């Protein structure tokens, strides 16, 4: 299912899938917003398909100037090889043609080589899209904004003209609110460090919440582990761990 | 001097010393988020702690050693500074 | 005038790059030295003719005084009003030096790095995100070229027979030639296989769209037009052309 | 310069490389460098544990 | 004759220009990757870093 695939997914940036399970209506309705703002944003600029178009303009041009090198004399009578065929002898007019040949071969050795060295950088975007492709579009990236700016979700490749394009959804935290943290808390002569959060305080009260979401708990046995005691770590704190398992014994 | 000139670069050496004291200061005071969103501010021995996990170490490690931590750290970079000083070759 | 110490026989020096760099008076035991007459290029820096006609003049490595008037580390600059502001860079000069069409008339301004700030960062401080944003955009990558064939017996020579005997003087540059674009040929196809063609097998939707919310519908082939495309894909093979 | 000009557009060509060279250099720096979208500094005191 | 043979030679700069460029490019945007994924991020990539 695909709500189950997208937890998934936000399991991979870390976050809880609880939090895209109560959230399900606002992350679909984000994702609705965003894939409808993409095509407005692509056809009010016309300057993001630059690429394409560029690779485009640059093939015409040195098609078109490798035509127009044919209008050239290269210091020979005319640039029309039955004119200086008909004007002239052949025995003295070889050597105009040969001036012609010498510049026509020239310049399309020239535009060989040019052809050459672009087709080696298309090449070496199409090993990039390539490399896009498999990590980003049949997989999950961790890799930091190689597939978009922010936490990695998932993206759709969609074809264009002698090109590629990716929608690139991503997950970038939007609301910020600071806190006290503390390294450790030691209850009983032992520090507790976090298993899988960080320590954080609303100003009376000590909380355990993970790290890219603000969804706090209450620090427990089983969401902290023990190492060493009170005097090792620089910062601890002093707070109380709840034991789960003394209610159960008292009842 | 013979129709051989040199067009200076756009961004002058300030301007990147600039960008990259920037990108030092997100790095130092927020960590990896500020690449990634709004920068959060984190204490640094905390997303130290936080490499560490990243690298298969538990963070208990990195807080019982931190004192030692730090000063391998000040001892490298000086070592950094000492070999940039000395080999001209490196670049 | 120059200060340059000849030994009493040499005549005429010369640069590292062996350029006459000076000169003996033939009527005079003076030095002269020869500079060049002062050059450079000549930029243009306008925006959109549909915006305004007017224009700045950049010249190239020269100062002001052998040519509103600013002086920039990338030459003598003309028609652009110096500011103390600095924003984004709209045209770039260089060296830092950016211009822009501003209330109107142009103006040459330090470029902005950015918005300052500052994170607040103590020792026992955290910022945590209290919600988030799903964020989508776009990445546009060249792929493929389009595939050209030059033949030299047409293109050198223009149907002569004597022409193409001459040509044939040359040995194999034309093969050679010919064999090089047709692996640029073959490149560009091994391109779009190596990027598109990375599936075993063709997947097709349920034709009940019913993902949890999550609307596709923009990215999803369209049926009702008569080229299997999304959207999304249609405006971007309308825009290129 | 005239004897020049019968050799067609290769100043064209030779100029509008060396151009895009230059250009790509600049773009070159700003891909590196210009990752960060502002410019944070560090706090005046450098208390980093 | 002259130039014919300034021509060549230049046309030969240009193209060994060219060719210098596109390695500098690539190595830029090596350095631009390793910025994105070193300095903004904690790497796994084995050697990269
Ligand atoms: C920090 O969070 C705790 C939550 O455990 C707050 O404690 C509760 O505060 C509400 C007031 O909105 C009371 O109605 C509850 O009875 C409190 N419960 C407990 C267990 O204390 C605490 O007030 C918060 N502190 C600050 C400064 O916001
Ligand atoms: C956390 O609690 C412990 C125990 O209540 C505190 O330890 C006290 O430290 C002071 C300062 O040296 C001593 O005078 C007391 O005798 C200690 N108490 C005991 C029972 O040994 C500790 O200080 C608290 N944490 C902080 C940061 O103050
Ligand atoms: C782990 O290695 C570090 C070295 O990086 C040890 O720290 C050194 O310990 C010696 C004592 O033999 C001191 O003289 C040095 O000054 C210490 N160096 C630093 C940078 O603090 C540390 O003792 C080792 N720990 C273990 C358990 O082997
Ligand atoms: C997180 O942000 C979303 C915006 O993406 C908030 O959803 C908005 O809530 C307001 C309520 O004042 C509505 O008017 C908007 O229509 C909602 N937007 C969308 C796209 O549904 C959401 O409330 C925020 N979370 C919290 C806890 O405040
Ligand atoms: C997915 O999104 C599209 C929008 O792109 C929805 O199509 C809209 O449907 C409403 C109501 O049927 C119309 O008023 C709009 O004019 C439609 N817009 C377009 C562009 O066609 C589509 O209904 C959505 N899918 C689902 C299942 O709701
Ligand atoms: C998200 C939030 O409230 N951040 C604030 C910041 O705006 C303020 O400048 C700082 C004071 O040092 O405290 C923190
Ligand atoms: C934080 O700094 C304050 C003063 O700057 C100091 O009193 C406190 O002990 C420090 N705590 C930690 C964990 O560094
Ligand atoms: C050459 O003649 C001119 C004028 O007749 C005089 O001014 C100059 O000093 C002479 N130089 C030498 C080297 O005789
Ligand atoms: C000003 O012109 C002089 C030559 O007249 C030149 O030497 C100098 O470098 C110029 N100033 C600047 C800042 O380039």
Same mark, same amino acid.
């Given at each position: 299912?695909?709500?189950?695939?997208?937890?998934?997914?936000?399991?991979?940036?870390?976050?809880?899938?609880? *939090?895209?399970?109560?959230?399900?209506?606002?992350?679909?309705?984000?994702?609705? !917003?965003?894939?409808?703002?993409?095509?407005?944003?692509?056809?009010?600029?016309?300057?993001?398909?630059?690429?394409?178009?560029? +690779?485009?303009?640059?093939?015409?041009?040195?098609?078109?100037?490798?035509?127009?090198?044919?209008?050239?004399?290269?210091?020979?009578?005319?640039?029309?090889?039955?004119?200086?065929?008909?004007?002239?002898?052949?025995?003295?007019?070889?050597?105009?043609?040969?001036?012609?040949?010498?510049?026509?071969?020239?310049?399309?050795?020239?535009?060989?080589?040019?052809?050459?060295?672009?087709?080696?950088?298309?090449?070496?975007?199409?090993?990039?899209?390539?490399?896009?492709?498999?990590?980003?579009?049949?997989?999950?990236?961790?890799?930091?904004?190689?597939?978009?700016?922010?936490?990695?979700?998932?993206?759709?490749?969609? !074809?264009?003209?002698?090109? *590629?394009?990716?929608?690139?959804?991503?997950? +970038?935290?939007?609301?910020?609110?600071?806190?006290?943290?503390?390294?450790?808390?030691?209850?009983?002569?032992?520090?507790?460090?976090?298993?899988?959060?960080?320590?954080?305080?609303?100003?009376?009260?000590?909380?355990?919440?993970?790290?890219?979401?603000?969804?706090?708990?209450?620090?427990?046995?089983?969401?902290?582990?023990? !190492?060493?005691?009170?005097?090792?770590?620089?910062?601890?704190?002093?707070?109380? *761990?709840?034991?789960?398992?003394?209610?159960?014994?008292?009842? | 001097?013979?129709?051989?000139?040199?067009?200076?670069?756009?961004?002058?050496?300030?301007?990147?010393?600039?960008?990259?004291?920037?990108?030092?200061?997100?790095?130092?005071?927020?960590?990896?988020?500020?690449?990634?969103?709004?920068?959060?501010?984190?204490?640094?021995?905390?997303?130290?702690?936080?490499?560490?996990?990243?690298?298969?170490?538990?963070?208990?490690?990195?807080?019982?050693?931190?004192?030692?931590?730090?000063?391998?750290?000040?001892?490298?970079?000086?070592?950094?500074?000492?070999?940039?000083?000395?080999?001209?070759?490196?670049? | 005038?120059?200060?340059?110490?000849?030994?009493?026989?040499?005549?005429?020096?010369?640069?590292?790059? @062996?350029? $006459? @760099?000076? &000169?003996? @008076?033939?009527?005079?035991?003076?030095?002269?030295?020869?500079?060049?007459?002062?050059?450079?290029?000549?930029?243009?820096?306008?925006?959109?003719?549909?915006?305004?006609?007017?224009?700045?003049?950049?010249?190239?490595? &020269?100062?002001?005084?052998?040519? %509103?008037?600013?002086?920039?580390?990338?030459?003598?600059?003309?028609?652009? #009003?110096?500011?103390?502001?600095?924003?984004?860079?709209?045209?770039?000069?260089?060296?830092?030096?950016?211009?822009?069409?501003?209330?109107?008339?142009?103006?040459?301004?330090?470029?902005?790095?950015?918005? #300052?700030?500052?994170?607040?960062?103590?020792?026992?401080?955290?910022?945590?995100?209290?919600?988030?944003?799903?964020? &989508?955009?776009?990445?546009?990558?060249?792929?493929?070229?389009?595939?050209?064939?030059?033949?030299?017996?047409?293109?050198?020579?223009?149907?002569?027979?004597?022409?193409? %005997?001459?040509?044939?003087?040359?040995?194999?540059?034309? $093969?050679?030639?010919?064999?090089?674009?047709?692996?640029?040929? /073959?490149?560009?196809?091994?391109? $779009?296989? #190596?990027?598109?063609?990375? /599936?075993?097998?063709?997947?097709? $939707?349920?034709?009940?769209?019913?993902?949890?919310?999550?609307?596709?519908?923009?990215?999803?082939? @369209?049926?009702?037009?008569?080229?299997?495309?999304?959207?999304?894909?249609?405006?971007?093979?309308?825009? &290129?052309?």
């Amino acid at each position: 299912p695909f709500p189950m695939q997208m937890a998934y997914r936000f399991n991979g940036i870390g976050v809880t899938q609880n *939090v895209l399970y109560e959230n399900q209506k606002l992350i679909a309705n984000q994702f609705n !917003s965003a894939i409808g703002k993409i095509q407005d944003s692509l056809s009010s600029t016309p300057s993001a398909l630059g690429k394409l178009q560029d +690779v485009v303009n640059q093939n015409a041009q040195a098609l078109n100037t490798l035509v127009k090198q044919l209008s050239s004399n290269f210091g020979a009578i005319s640039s029309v090889l039955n004119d200086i065929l008909s004007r002239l002898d052949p025995p003295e007019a070889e050597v105009q043609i040969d001036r012609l040949i010498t510049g026509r071969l020239q310049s399309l050795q020239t535009y060989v080589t040019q052809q050459l060295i672009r087709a080696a950088e298309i090449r070496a975007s199409a090993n990039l899209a390539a490399t896009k492709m498999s990590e980003c579009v049949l997989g999950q990236s961790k890799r930091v904004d190689f597939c978009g700016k922010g936490y990695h979700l998932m993206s759709f490749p969609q !074809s264009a003209p002698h090109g *590629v394009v990716f929608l690139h959804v991503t997950y +970038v935290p939007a609301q910020e609110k600071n806190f006290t943290t503390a390294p450790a808390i030691c209850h009983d002569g032992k520090a507790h460090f976090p298993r899988e959060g960080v320590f954080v305080s609303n100003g009376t009260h000590w909380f355990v919440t993970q790290r890219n979401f603000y969804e706090p708990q209450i620090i427990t046995t089983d969401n902290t582990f023990v !190492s060493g005691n009170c005097d090792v770590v620089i910062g601890i704190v002093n707070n109380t *761990v709840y034991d789960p398992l003394q209610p159960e014994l008292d009842s | 001097f013979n129709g051989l000139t040199v067009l200076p670069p756009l961004l002058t050496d300030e301007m990147i010393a600039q960008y990259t004291s920037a990108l030092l200061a997100g790095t130092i005071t927020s960590g990896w988020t500020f690449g990634a969103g709004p920068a959060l501010q984190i204490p640094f021995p905390m997303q130290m702690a936080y490499r560490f996990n990243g690298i298969g170490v538990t963070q208990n490690v990195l807080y019982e050693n931190q004192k030692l931590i730090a000063n391998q750290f000040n001892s490298a970079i000086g070592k950094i500074q000492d070999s940039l000083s000395s080999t001209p070759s490196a670049l | 005038e120059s200060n340059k110490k000849f030994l009493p026989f040499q005549q005429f020096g010369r640069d590292i790059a @062996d350029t $006459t @760099d000076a &000169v003996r @008076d033939p009527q005079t035991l003076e030095i002269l030295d020869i500079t060049p007459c002062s050059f450079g290029g000549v930029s243009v820096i306008t925006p959109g003719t549909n915006t305004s006609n007017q224009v700045a003049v950049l010249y190239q490595d &020269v100062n002001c005084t052998e040519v %509103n008037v600013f002086q920039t580390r990338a030459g003598c600059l003309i028609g652009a #009003e110096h500011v103390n502001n600095s924003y984004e860079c709209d045209i770039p000069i260089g060296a830092g030096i950016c211009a822009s069409y501003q209330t109107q008339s142009i103006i040459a301004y330090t470029m902005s790095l950015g918005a #300052e700030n500052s994170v607040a960062y103590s020792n026992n401080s955290i910022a945590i995100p209290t919600n988030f944003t799903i964020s &989508v955009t776009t990445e546009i990558l060249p792929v493929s070229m389009t595939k050209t064939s030059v033949d030299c017996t047409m293109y050198i020579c223009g149907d002569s027979t004597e022409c193409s %005997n001459l040509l044939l003087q040359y040995g194999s540059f034309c $093969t050679q030639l010919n064999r090089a674009l047709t692996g640029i040929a /073959v490149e560009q196809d091994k391109n $779009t296989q #190596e990027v598109f063609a990375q /599936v075993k097998q063709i997947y097709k $939707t349920p034709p009940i769209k019913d993902f949890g919310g999550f609307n596709f519908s923009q990215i999803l082939p @369209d049926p009702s037009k008569p080229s299997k495309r999304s959207p999304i894909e249609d405006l971007l093979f309308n825009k &290129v052309t």
